[PDB]
Amino acid sequence: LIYPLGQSSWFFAPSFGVAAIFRFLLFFQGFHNWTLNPFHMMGVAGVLGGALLCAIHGATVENTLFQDGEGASTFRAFNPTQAEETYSMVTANRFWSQIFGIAFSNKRWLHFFMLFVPVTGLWMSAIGVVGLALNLRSYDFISQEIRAAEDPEFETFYTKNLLLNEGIRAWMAPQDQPHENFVFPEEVLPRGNAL
Amino acid sequence: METLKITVYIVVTFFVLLFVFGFLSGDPARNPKRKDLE
Amino acid sequence: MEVNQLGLIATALFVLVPSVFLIILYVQTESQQK
Amino acid sequence: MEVNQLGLIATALFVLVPSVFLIILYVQTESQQK
Amino acid sequence: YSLGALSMMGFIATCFVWFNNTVYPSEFYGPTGPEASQAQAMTFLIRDQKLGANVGSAQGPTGLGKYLMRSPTGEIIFGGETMRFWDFRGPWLEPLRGPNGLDLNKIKNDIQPWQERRAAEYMTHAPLGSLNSVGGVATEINSVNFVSPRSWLATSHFVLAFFFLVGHLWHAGRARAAAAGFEKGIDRESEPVLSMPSLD
Amino acid sequence: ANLWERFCNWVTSTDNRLYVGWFGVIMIPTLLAATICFVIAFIAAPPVDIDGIREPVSGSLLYGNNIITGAVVPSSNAIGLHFYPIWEAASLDEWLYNGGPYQLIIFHFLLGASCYMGRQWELSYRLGMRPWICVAYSAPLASAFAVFLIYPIGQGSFSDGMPLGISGTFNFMIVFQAEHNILMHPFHQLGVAGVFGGALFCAMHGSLVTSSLIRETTETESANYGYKFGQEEETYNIVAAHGYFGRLIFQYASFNNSRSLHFFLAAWPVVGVWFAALGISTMAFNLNGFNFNHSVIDAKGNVINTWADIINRANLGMEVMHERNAHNFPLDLA
Amino acid sequence: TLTYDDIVGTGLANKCPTLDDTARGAYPIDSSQTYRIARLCLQPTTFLVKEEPKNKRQEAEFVPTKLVTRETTSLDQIQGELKVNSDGSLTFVEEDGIDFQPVTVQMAGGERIPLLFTVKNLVASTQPNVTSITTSTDFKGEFNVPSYRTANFLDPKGRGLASGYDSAIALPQAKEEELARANVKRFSLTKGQISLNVAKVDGRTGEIAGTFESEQLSDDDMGAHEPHEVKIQGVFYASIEPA
Amino acid sequence: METITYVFIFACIIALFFFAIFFREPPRIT
Amino acid sequence: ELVNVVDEKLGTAYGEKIDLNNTNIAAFIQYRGLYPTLAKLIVKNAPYESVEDVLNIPGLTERQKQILRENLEHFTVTEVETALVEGGDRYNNGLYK
Amino acid sequence: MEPNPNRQPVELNRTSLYLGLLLILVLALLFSSYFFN
Amino acid sequence: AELTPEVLTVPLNSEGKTITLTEKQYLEGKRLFQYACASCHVGGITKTNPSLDLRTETLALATPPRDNIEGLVDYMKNPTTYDGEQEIAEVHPSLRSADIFPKMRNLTEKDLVAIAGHILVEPKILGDKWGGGKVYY
Ligand code: CLA
Ligand code: CLA
Ligand code: CLA
Ligand SMILES: CC(C)=CCC/C(C)=C/CC/C(C)=C/CC/C(C)=C/CC/C(C)=C/CC/C(C)=C/CC/C(C)=C/CC/C(C)=C/CC/C(C)=C/CC1=CC(=O)C(C)=C(C)C1=O
Ligand SMILES: CC(C)=CCC/C(C)=C/CC/C(C)=C/CC/C(C)=C/CC/C(C)=C/CC/C(C)=C/CC/C(C)=C/CC/C(C)=C/CC/C(C)=C/CC1=CC(=O)C(C)=C(C)C1=O
Ligand SMILES: CCCCCCCCCCCCCCCC(=O)OC[C@H](CO[C@@H]1O[C@H](CS(=O)(=O)O)[C@@H](O)[C@H](O)[C@H]1O)OC(=O)CCCCCCCCCCCCCCC
Ligand SMILES: CCCCCCCCCCCCCCCC(=O)OC[C@H](COP(=O)(O)OC[C@@H](O)CO)OC(=O)CCCCCCCCCCCCCCC
Ligand SMILES: CCCCCCCCCCCCCCCC(=O)OC[C@H](COP(=O)(O)OC[C@@H](O)CO)OC(=O)CCCCCCCCCCCCCCC
Ligand SMILES: CCCCCCCCCCCCCCCC(=O)OC[C@H](COP(=O)(O)OC[C@@H](O)CO)OC(=O)CCCCCCCCCCCCCCC
Ligand SMILES: CC1=C(/C=C/C(C)=C/C=C\C(C)=C\C=C\C=C(C)\C=C\C=C(C)\C=C\C2=C(C)CCCC2(C)C)C(C)(C)CCC1
Ligand code: OEX
Ligand SMILES: [Ca+2]
Ligand SMILES: [Cl-]
Ligand SMILES: [Cl-]
Ligand SMILES: [Cl-]
Ligand SMILES: [Fe+2]
């Protein structure tokens, strides 16, 4: 909603489709350099961090279970109404303390943290996209551009990525934005050697 | 640079030998429960 | 490099101000009666 | 005016660091038992 | 133990079918990636030399030879990106190889039509293609129904070797826990950590 | 006890603040070497001729990078898969020019992280735990192997390993899209389902458990104090949680078994991420994403574009622009 | 007799052939016969760069440098006409071969100096009346040094000569004048000079070996900065043939 | 000055790791 | 005062015709009978002081001479541009499809 | 660990806070001109 | 738009004669082209020599002319360089070199006609895309 509302039309919103959404991703790279945006970076951290917490918590619980049955398959050895913790917080805490250096000691904190991390991540990403609605991007580092402008031997992965962005824009724009009636002659298309 | 090479080779061999002989040193017995696994 | 000349103070205050807030709260927590 | 462009962060930290030290000490003093 | 071993073997087979063209002849399995990249370089060296290019003295945009350059140990090799594949060896290329690597006089005088044919064939049967078996780079149009056998076998065996490594960890760890008698969980009345001193 | 016996007892000691163990005996030096080399390079390494075309790329802070742009740059395409330790170089200046730090760092890192996983098993064994936390860790680890080792192997050069840097990471991603159309690859889609889903279930679980905490505190104190470390009684009411979520969707779509639930929580992101990793690792051998370029054709034979073809145009931009000086011949075959 | 498998990865492939100490003979030149160099090889052992004068404007010296591009430096399989001139001097007219190598060397303090080490279109001549090539024969001549990058080369902001943007697109409204030197790529073409000092001659085989010194400009980054002066020293080998 | 800032923040983070690990409030069973 | 020499060359006859002294060899595909044999001979024997000098290349057949004559209106000559002819760029200028 | 008996509580009363802030702020007001130069 | 008889009507020879291909011939042509040619000529270009494409105008300017069924069929029997000067059967698939290019062994005269017809019809449909390469994908 907000993004297309900041742009020219609904046309530039994501279309509801798998490949269309992928196109939306690649558009955001080439036009917004959206990966470079620290709000997106916080989004990424929150998503991957959330998946990490999910996996690590599930595995930790599943590997610090109390033996509450005779079965080698341990799922039946739990009762919903039971009062006791099904796994050992103390053993889990020692394990991670000795493995990783720190560990949860408070289950309520652990689970609130499990709420906090992915929700906050997504919210940060939302803020960044709000910026992109206005084309208020993190596209460039000005110091980088000034240096590279004066020094043709100066190269970083940042400048390489901008070359990639420029390619994306020129090669995809005519078909991706048919209302603009783009005609890009072979000769204006940015290309490296051979390709 | 040959001396650095020899040094690193020796270091690596050292730690590797520690790893291998270490796990060879009755590792199954090193647990809080049933030790007689031989 | 032609960086923004305010980036230094921006970063420094960004770190220091909330860090200081937290240290104040922690330390005044510790000194409360056990 | 062509001032030293570090004067701002210098003055800011000069003010803030010891002021903060004192605020920390005061607040953890107040929270002590009466 | 057997799962670990099979995992290891899987990865070995993956690299074998990806790089080796002896027990996996390119006649049957298609060219290796290195083979095909080298074959492209060979193809255009041939083409442009036919047009009158001096391929030994041809300087590319970067300063490196357009067709020919040196490996980091000085061997004469095909240039451009295929610089990475200079360790490639194949029956169609070796007759052009001298003591110091690719021999310029042999290149100028001794390239046979069967070599041009072979290089063109392998270049255009490079092991690149989509999951639905559309041959070529990811941006290529539909037309050619092709994915190299080398790709099918390498990808399949990497997937298999990896899950077998996973199986190895699962079963080795379970065998350890079961042997020690806690694969079903911690004894509530005998929780080991509770008898251990605190860390701090 | 003799000296060796004593040493073995210390190494495998469950009382060390950080567990060492035999995996740790390998892990510690390799991770320290990798870390130190990484940090030093990231601050001070000179530009690196990543693509072997005598076009050095600056990765370090002192050579004009910030945190976002900075990287440890991959070793030269001229090196390829050749092993390039410091001692194969005629000098440190040469080693640096050709990107030796990249190989040193990634090899020590991969060794060390493999040992981290083994170490997780080892300590789980020492503490009388079930052993499979390490299997969960196999998901991110494999992924690192995919980007630092398997892809380079497949493409024939460590110059194609993911750079050790944020923007370099993005470069790797964009080029990967160009060359394999990874977005259109089902293993990557499974990866995405894995991390989106992982985050969803993390937030979900967090929210339900938080939602059903038993009142143990007043409003003027944190509810976290309502739980005491090591208490026997569960701190939330799972029956109420299940009662809620089961009504939110429907009863049988909700877990009433905490063990089954936590197993699901472990399995979804781990399996998904395993597929992401296998995606990278099989695109390493150029079995690439779905290609529906010109799949739709009208009665005359006119091409009717779909979203796949627009993707294709973007991919084309990427393909033609990347490493603008590295190609002499028309096809990018690896 | 060594094969590729004997040589590969040893470094020997970047070395020119040598002649043993007994090779102090003389190779007779028949002025009625036509001759060629079938293989000219140049193996650099030292790259020296002239320091940029502080401003004292005394004699700036050539200082040592460290090779960072590994054993990728030698010129080889070079061939060309060997003319016998009317005054009895010999003139080598380079026709073809691997007659260039990009090389990057590093100065004290870190400055990297790329150069196109080359003998392209070499024309080198001996002293008059060389009735035989001996360990007293020398060749002196000049060659072409084209731009280290050719015209398609694109800088990191996509600007190039035969390809690329013609402006600083990341600075859409910056004043162009100050950036002109960076925006407008130029293609260098300069002269180098080389002396070949024969130290060894096999009269029977027509093989000669010796030392060389060449002087040429380094990379100017398509006109973005001033090139450095480079002096290259090393050994050479050539096989002379009637043709 | 940028580099100094970045390295400084990083070093502060590593020191923080050190304190957070070895000088954490110890977990106590009540 | 700095000039892009290729762009500048595009404002000469080089931008209008096949420049026997500079144009990359694939341009000879534009006209019947020129590629690859005559194209190769032309590039190999360049530079030329005038277009007609192309008829003086040794070894030509009468047929080849006639094709060249029919195609002289499509040729030009300008000063050799180092940037277009170094690197063997006349044989492969890094452009494919 | 067995606790350290040399430990002492630390104090800063309000008057001392005000005096200290006065010192710091006035010093800053004085020297700032010289920092900006 | 439809694949009409007019689209499928292509030059038989250099003398103004045309031939109208059937839809089944067009399909056979696509199939056989993919089978024998597309590995190098996908989309009308030439991977091992991009300077030469399968565009109709280019074929028109080849020697002898190849912008008709006959020219292309003869090419498939006895391929030449673009100027007709040398015979290239030894490095290019043809009936004459079916011994070294085994996929040509089962190709019949009818097959050659179908392939030729594909080559001439495809640009009438796809325009610049045929022989355009990646720029037009
Ligand atoms: C490490 C890799 C990585 C990661 C982890 C992410 C993760 C993230 N990216 Mg992505 N991104 C990446 C790389 C990555 N990105 C790259 C390389 C690019 C190219 C530049 C992009 C470009 C990109 C864009 C352009 C966008 C993202 C977005 C986001 C976020 C998506 C959050 C979400 O799940 O929305 C999914 C949608 C929702 C949560 C909305 C609600 C969905 C409802 C509940 C669905 C209900 C379904 C219903 C039951 C019916 C189903 C029917 C069925 C048949 C389908 C997220 C933070 C988005 C974002 O930032 O938004 C703020 C976004 O727009 N990213
Ligand atoms: C990531 C890979 C990995 C991991 C984490 C483990 C971990 C585990 N394995 Mg091993 N294993 C592996 C691969 C791995 N294995 C492979 C590929 C094989 C087939 C060769 C085996 C074969 C194997 C057997 C036969 C057995 C184990 C055992 C076990 C478990 C007990 C620990 C053991 O004694 O260490 C043994 C560790 C290894 C054999 C390999 C570890 C490899 C990592 C990367 C460390 C490498 C260290 C090395 C010294 C560094 C080289 C440096 C170089 C420059 C010189 C344990 C769960 C034992 C067990 O209890 O099973 C029930 C047992 O008896 N494993
Ligand atoms: C845990 C200890 C450890 C390990 C495993 C490594 C491992 C590695 N380091 Mg070293 N490194 C270490 C500590 C360690 N380092 C330390 C403390 C320093 C500081 C002095 C360094 C400094 C260093 C440098 C400066 C460099 C390395 C590099 C290397 C690599 C090449 C080593 C080699 O060629 O060995 C050769 C040794 C063998 C093959 C051992 C054979 C002898 C045994 C007994 C036979 C059995 C081993 C066999 C392979 C199977 C394994 C057993 C398994 C089944 C359990 C390698 C990745 C280089 C590098 O990374 O290059 C890119 C490099 O440049 N390291
Ligand atoms: C030389 C120098 C300069 C080098 C530096 C260069 C290099 C690039 C540095 C990187 C720079 C920087 C770090 C980049 C990242 C910046 C940015 C993207 C960060 C995002 C900022 C943040 C606000 C985003 C908001 C969204 C959200 C808050 C993300 C936070 C993610 C969070 C940390 C996830 C947790 C991951 C962490 C591993 C959890 C540990 C928990 C662990 C103890 C579980 C173990 C455990 C499990 C159990 O089940 C139980 C029961 C117990 C008991 C138990 O213990
Ligand atoms: C104007 C009109 C006429 C108004 C009329 C309204 C009228 C009253 C309506 C009445 C009739 C009505 C019923 C007709 C219906 C119409 C139609 C069917 C609507 C469809 C709408 C909509 C698209 C349906 C979508 C389907 C559904 C929502 C998909 C999402 C659900 C999803 C698949 C659940 C499965 C995933 C499952 C594994 C989740 C578990 C993982 C995660 C939650 C673990 C966390 C967790 C779980 C626990 O379990 C507990 C315990 C705890 C602790 C815990 O951490
Ligand atoms: C038409 C196709 C032809 C067929 C071909 C067959 C294909 C193979 C299918 C694979 C079979 C899977 C078996 C699952 C068994 C199992 O897990 O048992 C373990 C428990 C047992 O259930 C628990 O069972 C317990 C009883 S007992 O343990 O079973 O005895 C009970 O106490 C508990 O309440 C209950 O939840 O299962 C669960 O905990 C809940 C289900 C969780 C889902 C597991 C799948 C893993 C995650 C999905 C992977 C991610 C993919 C997406 C990528 C992001
Ligand atoms: C049987 C098939 C196995 C599939 C691969 C492994 C998946 C589950 C392992 C994830 C590891 C997470 C961290 C460990 C977390 C951990 O500790 O788990 C603990 C959990 C409980 O342990 P138990 O001791 O009770 O049972 C395991 C043995 O001891 C046998 O009883 O183990 C299992 O549930 C194994 C599940 C086997 C059956 C599950 C099959 C589900 C996958 C089906 C494939 C679908 C993919 C299609 C994609 C589109
Ligand atoms: C082999 C040894 C490996 C050692 C490696 C070092 C690991 C360091 C782990 C993080 C230390 C700092 C933790 C501070 C905070 C701290 O002290 O944690 C302690 C905390 C303890 O939780 P408790 O349950 O005990 O406390 C709950 C109550 O206090 C409620 O308030 O653990 C968590 O909160 C886990 C969730 C956050 C986990 C954050 C992990 C982030 C990792 C690093 C991310 C930054 C990267 C920057 C790179 C430049
Ligand atoms: C490189 C890292 C740098 C970080 C370090 C941080 C630096 C911290 C600096 C601490 C300084 C704080 C001073 C404490 C200030 C304060 O606590 O004073 C009051 C204090 C009274 O102490 P008492 O013995 O009464 O005990 C009270 C206790 O609660 C104090 O903790 O006297 C002193 O501290 C001695 C110095 C007298 C200072 C009097 C000067 C104020 C008069 C006004 C001057 C300005 C106006 C002039 C107008 C012309
Ligand atoms: C036919 C073939 C041939 C030959 C083959 C060979 C002869 C090979 C071999 C044999 C062998 C000889 C193999 C192997 C190796 C072995 C193994 C793989 C080992 C392992 C180890 C382990 C696993 C142990 C574990 C651990 C330790 C480490 C420590 C402590 C604990 C334990 C004991 C557990 C060739 C190649 C020429 C060519 C091709 C074909
Ligand atoms: O190095 Mn990095 O990226 Ca794998 O593709 Mn070929 O090489 Mn280069 O181009 Mn595209
Ligand atoms: Ca002498
Ligand atoms: Cl290439
Ligand atoms: Cl790139
Ligand atoms: Cl054309
Ligand atoms: Fe939980």
Structure tokens at B38: 């031989």
CB under 8 Å to G56, separation ≥6 — which residues? none
Largest Cα–Cα distance of chain F, in whole Å? 88
Question: Cβ(G145)–Cβ(G216) under 8 Å?
Answer: yes
Could you count the other beta carbons within 10 Å of the beta carbon of residue E22? 10
The parent domain of residue E91 ranges over: 31-126
The residue among G38, G37, G127 whose CA lies nearest residue G82 is G37
Question: Which residues constitute the domain of residue K97?
Answer: 2-130
Give how far the C-alpha of residue K44 lies from the chain's centroid of Cα atoms, to the nearest Å: 9
- Token code pair at residue A21: 């959404």
CATH number for the domain spanning G36: value is: 2.40.160.30
Give every CB contact of residue F210 below 8 A, 6+ residues apart in sequence: A108, A111, A112, A115, F236
D and A touching (3 or more beta-carbon pairs closer than 8 Å): no
CA-based nearest residue to G152, from F96, A194, F46: A194
Placement of tokens 């000049």 in the chain: G142
Binding residues of F for Fe cation: 205, 262
Whole-number Å distance between alpha carbons of F313 and F329: 21
Cβ neighbours around G39 below 10 Å, total = 20
Separation CA G201–CA G40 (nearest Å): 14
Structural domain containing residue G207: 21-149+186-243
Task: Indicate the pairing of strand G75-84 with strand G90-98.
Answer: antiparallel
> What DSSP letter does each residue of E161-184 carry, written as one string?
HHHHHHHHHHHHHHHHHHHHT-TT
Residues in contact with A41: Cβ distance below 8 Å, sequence separation at least 6, in sequence order:
A35, F166
* Sign for the pseudo-dihedral over CA of F219, F220, F223, F227: negative
Q: Say whether E140 counts as a known binding-site residue.
A: no
DSSP F297: B
Specified resolution (Å): 4.5
Residue closest to I10 by CA, chosen among I66, I76, I58: I76
Contact indicator for K45, K133 with CB cutoff of 8 Å? yes
Closest atom of ligand 2 to F138 CA is 1
From E157, G175, E138, select the one nearest F320 (Cα to Cα): E138
DSSP code per residue over A43-84: HHHHHHHHHHHHHHHHHHHHTSBB--SS-SS-GGG--TT--B
What gap in Å lies between CA E138 and CA F312, rounded to an integer? 8
Q: Taking a C-beta distance cutoff of 8 angstroms, is the pair G75, G96 a contact?
A: no
Amino acid in position B23: F
Q: Check if the beta carbon of residue G149 is closer than 8 Å to that of residue E61.
A: yes
Q: Which amino acid is at A157?
A: F
- What are G189's strand-pairing partners? G146
Domain presence at residue G14: no
Counting Cα atoms < 13 Å in the Cβ hemisphere of G176 gives 7
Task: Give, as one character, the DSSP assignment of residue A65.
Answer: B
Number of C-beta neighbours around residue K57 at 10 A: 12
Could you tell me if residue G50 is inside a domain?
yes
CB neighbourhood size of E21 (10 A)? 21
Helices then strands, each counted (H, E), chain G: 2, 14
E126 Cβ neighbours under 8 A, 6+ residues apart: E31, E33, E36, E37, E39, E40, E136, E148, F331, F333, F334
Residue F53: CATH number of its domain: 1.20.85.10
- K70 occurs within a structural domain: yes
The 3-state DSSP class for residue F224 equals: helix
Residues G110 and G37 in one domain: yes
Query: Which of I6, I25, I38 minimizes the C-alpha distance to I92?
Result: I25
Q: How far does the centroid of ligand 9 lie from the alpha carbon of residue C32, in Å?
A: 24
- According to the entry, how was the structure determined? X-ray
Asked whether F191 and F276 are in contact (CB, 8 A), the reply is yes
Q: Rounded distance, CA I38 to CA I20, Å?
A: 11
Domain count, chain K: 1
Q: What are φ and ψ of residue G223, in 5° steps?
A: 90, 5
Q: Could you tell me the CA-to-CA distances from E192 to A72, E180, F220, F236 in Å, in that order?
A: 20, 13, 37, 26
**Bridge partner list, G63:** G49
G227-to-A149, G52, G188, K12 alpha-carbon distances in Å: 19, 10, 10, 62
How far, in Å, CA of I4 to CA of I84, rounded?
12
List of residues 6+ apart from F273 with CB closer than 8 A:
A51, A55, F139, F140, F142, F143, F191, F194, F195, F198
Q: Is A160 on the interface with G (CB under 8 A)?
A: yes
Q: Are G120 and G145 in contact (CB under 8 A)?
A: yes
Q: What is the CATH number of the domain that holds K10?
A: 1.10.760.10
Tell me how far CA of residue E129 lies from CA of E31, E135, E147, in angstroms.
Answer: 13, 4, 5
| Residue that the structure tokens 């949680």 belong to | F241
Contact K48 E117 (CB under 8 A): no
CA–CA gap between residue F293 and residue K42 (Å, rounded): 13
Name which of K100, G7, A175, K76 is nearest E112 in CA terms. K100
Q: Do H21 and A105 touch (CB under 8 A)?
A: no
G154 in contact with F at a CB cutoff of 8 Å?
yes
Q: Token pair for residue I9?
A: 């060359």
Do residues I69 and I63 lie in contact, with contact meaning Cβ atoms separated by under 8 Å?
no
Q: Which ligand 4 atom is nearest residue A41's CA? A: 18
Pick from F185, F260, F262 the residue to mutate for probing ligand 6's pocket: most ligand atoms within 8 Å of its CB: F260
Under DSSP, the state recorded for F132 is T
Give the one of E176, E179, E192 whose C-beta lies nearest to B32's C-beta. E192
Atom of ligand 10 nearest to the CA of B24: 30
Domain check: are G81 and G47 in the same one? yes
Tokens of J14: 């309000």
**Closest C-alpha residue for ligand 9 atom 18:** J16
Is the sign of the CA dihedral F16, F21, F23, F25 positive or negative? positive
- The CATH homologous superfamily for domain I1-86 is Photosystem II 12 kDa extrinsic protein (1.10.150.320)
* Ligand 13 centroid – CA F254 distance (Å): 56
Residue A70, Cβ neighbours under 10 Å: how many?
8
| Two tokens, residue B32 | 């809080």
Q: Answer yes or no: is the C-beta of B23 below 6 A from any ligand 10 atom.
A: yes
Which residues on adjacent β-strands are paired with residue G194? G141, G214
Answer yes or no: do K50 and F330 touch at CB < 8 A.
yes
- The pair of structure tokens assigned to F16 is 């060390």
- Which of F296, F301, F300, F332 lies closest to F316, judged by CA? F332
Backbone dihedral region of J20: left (phi > 0), alpha (psi from -120 to 50 degrees) or beta?
Answer: alpha
Residues G144 and G239 in one domain: yes
Residue E194 pairs in a beta bridge with none
Under a CB-based contact definition with an 8 Å cutoff, are residues A26 and F314 in contact? yes
Same domain (yes/no): G36, G84: yes
Dihedral through CA K66, CA K67, CA K71, CA K73, nearest 10?
110
> What 3-state DSSP class applies to K49?
coil
Q: How far is CA G172 from CA A104, A149, A154, G175, in A?
A: 52, 12, 19, 9
Cβ–Cβ under 8 Å, residues G75 and G89: no
Per-residue CA distances from J13 to A17, C31, D34, G140 (Å): 66, 14, 13, 90
In sequence order, the 6+-apart residues with CB closer than 8 A to the CB of E45 are E55, E67, E68, E78, E107
What residues have CB less than 8 Å from G222, skipping those under 6 apart? A152, G147, G149, G153, G155, G160, G161, G185, G186, G187, G188
Give the Cα-Cα-Cα angle F165, F170, F176 (nearest 5 degrees).
120
Say whether both G47 and G140 belong to one domain. Answer: yes
Contacts of F46 (CB under 8 A, 6+ apart): F56, F58, F60, F63, F96, F97, G110, G112
Strand I18-19 and strand I75-76: pairing? parallel
Q: Answer whether F263 contacts ligand 6 (Cβ < 6 A).
A: yes
3-state secondary structure of G190: strand
What's the full length of chain E, in residues?
Answer: 200
Residue type, G129: N
What does the radius of gyration of chain F's CA atoms come to, in whole angstroms? 25
**Which residues 6+ apart lie within 8 Å of A119 measured at CB?**
A46, F203
Q: Which long-range contacts (CB under 8 A, 24 or more apart) does F173-177 make?
A: F173/A35, F174/A29, F174/A161, F174/A164, F174/F318, F174/F322, F175/A164, F175/F318, F175/F322, F175/F323, F176/F280, F176/F283, F177/A26, F177/F314, F177/F315, F177/F318
Q: List E129's β-bridge partners, or say none.
A: E135, F287
**Domain count within chain G:** 2
Dihedral angle sign, alpha carbons of residues G220, G223, G225, G228:
positive
Find the ligand nearest to H17 CA.
Answer: 8
* Residue I93, both tokens: 């200028």
Residue G176, domain member (yes or no): yes
Beta strands G189-202; G27-28: pairing state: unpaired
Distance CA E79, CA E55 (A): 10
Q: Which residues pair with K80 in a beta bridge?
A: K87
Q: What span, in angstroms and rounded, lies between the C-alpha atoms of F167 and F57?
A: 12
Query: What tokens appear for K135 in the block?
Result: 């720029």
Contact I37 K85 (CB under 8 A): yes
Beta bridge partners of B6: none
- Contact assessment for residue A163 and residue F321, using Cβ atoms and an 8 Å cutoff: yes
Q: How many CB atoms lie within 10 A of CB I78?
A: 18
d(CA G154, CA G132): 50
CATH number at residue G158: 3.30.2050.10
To the nearest whole angstrom, how far is the Cα of C10 from the nearest Cα of chain D? Answer: 9
Q: Measured between CB atoms, which of F195, F223, F318 is closest to A51?
A: F195
Domain that holds residue F38: 3-184
K76 falls within a domain: yes
The C-alpha atoms of residue C8 and residue E40 are separated, in whole angstroms, by 52
Instruction: State yes or no: cis peptide before K64, omega within 30 of 0.
Output: yes
Instruction: List, in sequence order, the alpha helices (H) in chain G.
Output: 4-7, 180-183
Which residue bears the tokens 């270490």? B22
Is residue F184 within a helix (H) or strand (E), and if so which, with residue range? Answer: none
In the block, tokens 């279309």 appear at A15
A75 ligand 6 Cβ < 6 A? yes
Nearest ligand for residue J26 CA: 9
Q: How many CB atoms lie within 10 A of CB F101?
A: 26
Nearest CA to ligand 2 atom 54: B12
